[PDB]
Design a protein around this ligand. Structure first.
Ligand SMILES: CC(=O)CC(=O)SCCNC(=O)CCNC(=O)[C@H](O)C(C)(C)COP(=O)(O)OP(=O)(O)OC[C@H]1O[C@@H](n2cnc3c(N)ncnc32)[C@H](O)[C@@H]1OP(=O)(O)O
Ligand SMILES: CC(=O)CC(=O)SCCNC(=O)CCNC(=O)[C@H](O)C(C)(C)COP(=O)(O)OP(=O)(O)OC[C@H]1O[C@@H](n2cnc3c(N)ncnc32)[C@H](O)[C@@H]1OP(=O)(O)O
Lengths: 354, 354
């Protein structure tokens, strides 16, 4: 019922970015058919029909191509050359469907010296300067989960490519190939730091910048109960609101942006936040612009009033999952359909007329 | 010359996610016109025309509405109510252009108890469980820059909503409002962790999971020269390739997934990686499936062969910037146009026939 209602998508079962992009398309209403090798508990596989095919068999190849011939989009996330070998490369698909958006999701891209090399998120963000910039200054870099390569710089770019190529097709009548490399997407994702580096506004020193934890006003603080708050009071009026809530006299602290005295400033804020529990600070800063928020663990999220009231999550047999994002005022997305029994590929073809 | 050639976008100048979204649209060929308060060194404002208007004045409002009348998309990233008070709210824009995609970029969303509160990336990811999950276990949480709220779970969800709504418009003939809240987008961005929590595959203990640094085969290691490599060898055949490169006998190490002995395993891997410099390991693992990559600082990226060969970056002005992502085979994006001088708003209208 979302805005992608009517869109047909064939997804070749992979890991990480590919199934996440296919999930978001299905979340928004697309008709997504996932082909796996011959009832899932994986909530990521919500909003699909699952079928199976031996793509290396004559029958399996034939059936996939029939499906693809009726699709708008194809997603694959194998090594470059894998679909080519199978007879499912962009050139073969063009023969049956030149309107097809052929979406290729990789870490290293379709070509280049590392294009054939295995890897995972942490590898892709290692080569482009991102990982080096994450973590405390006095320790080795820490992975920001697989959030930056696989998803922000991976599936999200695949999604933009797919939907952009669909817009182009309104006018040209034709599809094309989208080459989404996580090493590329995540670089554009961090374009801000590349821009700042050029003007002296960001340095290559880990943990010593405005947004990486180096600034006392942009970091977490441990409270009296051992839980945490997040402070993000960058602008002077918000920072002042923060000091006001803590009851600290600005005249007695270092200037907010005197980096030479940041340790002094941080020590004073640390003592202040440590004096009470996390929930105390929620009360103190209620409806303020102080940019002070509780750092909630996953399992406490479903109790936060702002999360509850906006229905950011739903209960999926077992536990909470995120509702579709973003939101649409007229063609709103439905609550996701849970994973279901595998069905027969020929049933899908009858439906699709292929 | 990219896939979005022909698309008209009005951007109301803001910070963080909004300009990043508008940047990507411009990168991919969109005609983007940014209205600012009455030549930039900010590389992010690439691929724009900049104009100026006092939106609080009669004239400025009239001129903004004439421009918006001719647009496909409007991006705004102020607090809920701000454009409404201006006379630029969705209901006003709909009177002059019911095909307009009205894209609203915020942290907390358009409603709810936190909806009027100031904040930045760190606050948005503090409330939904994400920040709590980032960093070493023995320390307070560390922000993953502003990569996860502002961009992966922010601008990129704004982009997916804009382009999805443009798809829907093909059939309905109408636009609608896109409500992109960083608290929601970033939650869908981390859907994999919500799915895993339900099946016992992810815990709320920071630094103690497969992908957060807890696993010895998915983390960075410091080398003889104080520089780092990234290991990402999750799959057993990749892990074996890693140990082969290290010259370690698998028979003499704890099993890869015996978590009880992970400290022992990490101690042996630490001793191995510590015995030579980063670039030694870079060489040893340059071509294998071991998932071991050198961790490059921003300043080194431009020297990495895979980065060079694929033109992931271009030289803009005294610095590298990321080329457009993702890539398109038929309608490829141009090298970004640098920020140029402000132009007169009527010049844009003349051009757009406003
Ligand atoms: S999480 C992010 C991890 N990284 C990525 O996704 C980047 C892109 N992908 C890759 O680099 C790799 O797929 C990977 C490193 C993740 C895994 O590598 P891998 O396990 O060696 O798989 P890969 O090289 O992609 O090959 C997949 C094989 O399964 C086959 N396959 C896939 N679906 C199939 C089906 N339904 N029926 C039959 N075979 C199938 C393919 O034909 C291919 O076989 P070949 O090696 O003979 O050509
Ligand atoms: C920046 C980082 O490093 C990290 C980040 O996360 S950036 C993301 C920041 N968060 C967000 O963007 C969420 C949405 N926006 C906001 O919450 C807020 O804009 C903010 C907290 C960031 C800033 O707060 P603020 O400075 O009080 O701005 P805001 O409340 O949006 O109002 C902007 C005012 O400028 C005006 N304005 C904007 N463009 C104008 C123009 N061209 N002419 C005249 N007025 C203009 C408006 O009329 C509005 O005035 P009013 O208060 O009278 O209604």
């Amino acid at each position: 019922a979302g805005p992608l209602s009517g869109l047909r998508v064939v997804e070749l079962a992979g890991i990480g970015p590919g199934p996440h992009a296919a999930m978001i398309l299905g979340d928004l209403g697309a008709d997504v058919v996932r082909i796996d090798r011959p009832i899932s508990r994986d909530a990521m596989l919500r909003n699909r029909r699952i079928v199976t095919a031996d793509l290396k068999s004559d029958q399996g190849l034939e059936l996939a191509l029939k499906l693809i011939a009726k699709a708008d989009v194809l997603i694959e996330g194998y090594r470059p050359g894998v679909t080519e070998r199978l007879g499912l490369g962009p050139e073969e698909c063009a023969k049956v469907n030149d309107r097809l958006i052929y979406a290729r999701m990789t870490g290293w891209g379709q070509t280049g010296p590392r294009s054939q090399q295995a890897g995972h998120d942490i590898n892709y963000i290692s080569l482009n300067g991102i990982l080096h910039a994450i973590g405390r200054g006095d320790e080795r870099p820490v992975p920001p989960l697989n959030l930056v390569g696989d998803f922000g710089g991976g599936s999200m770019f695949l999604l933009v490519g797919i939907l952009a190529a669909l817009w182009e097709r309104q006018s040209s009548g034709k599809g094309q190939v989208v080459d989404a490399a996580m090493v590329d997407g995540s670089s554009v994702l961090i374009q801000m730091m590349w821009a700042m580096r050029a003007t002296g506004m960001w340095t290559d020193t880990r943990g010593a910048n405005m947004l990486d934890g180096g600034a006392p006003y942009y970091d977490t603080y441990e409270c009296a109960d051992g839980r945490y708050v997040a402070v993000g009071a960058i602008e002077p009026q918000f920072y002042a609101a923060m000091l006001a809530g803590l009851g600290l006299d600005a005249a007695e602290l270092p200037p907010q942006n005197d980096r030479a005295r940041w340790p002094e400033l941080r020590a004073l804020l640390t003592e202040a936040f440590a004096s009470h529990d996390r929930d105390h600070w929620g009360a103190v800063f209620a409806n303020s612009d102080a940019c002070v928020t509780p750092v909630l663990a996953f399992g406490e999220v479903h109790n936060e009033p702002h999360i509850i009231e906006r229905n950011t999550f739903y209960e999926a047999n077992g536990g909470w999952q995120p509702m579709p994002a973003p939101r649409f005022s007229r063609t709103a997305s439905s609550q996701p359909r849970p994973p279901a029994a595998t069905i027969d590929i020929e049933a899908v073809l009858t439906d699709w007329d292929g």
